[PDB]
Amino acid sequence: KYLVEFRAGKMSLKGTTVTPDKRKGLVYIQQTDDSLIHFCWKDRTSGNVEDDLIIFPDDCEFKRVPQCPSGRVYVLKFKAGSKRLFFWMQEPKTDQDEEHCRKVNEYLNN
């Protein structure tokens, strides 16, 4: 099972052009027996996990990006490495989109 899970796709930079990934993916957080928190992104179509990163408490911060008019975009900033990942909610309703973001932040910071 997962502490938190929601439908969201990833994004990539095509040089100087921002381009969203049309592939459907599922973002979820799982806790291993070692008490570590793993942030993963899996393709719904293939069911394979392409992203697997180990995140420690307060290690990263998840926050909405005001720079995107959509308002459905959230970014994960890595304190160590300055790594940045962009995700966009795929749920039809935006009412619960904010709730999912908050839950993710709590697990990452707690």
Ligand X SMILES: *[C@H](c1cccc(NC(=O)c2ccc(C)cc2)c1)[C@@H](C#N)C(=O)Nc1ccccc1C(=O)O
C-alpha pair distances (Å), 1 with each of 19, 21, 64, 88 = 31, 26, 25, 22
Contact 60, 108 (CB under 8 A): yes
Q: Which of residues 47-106 bind ligand X (CB under 6 A)?
A: 67-68, 70, 73, 86, 88
Q: How far is the CB of 104 from ligand X (least distance, A)?
A: 18
CB of 70 to ligand X, least distance (A): 5
State yes or no: residue 41 binds ligand X (CB under 6 A).
no
* Binding footprint of ligand X on the chain (CB under 6 A): 11, 13, 18-20, 67-68, 70, 73, 86, 88
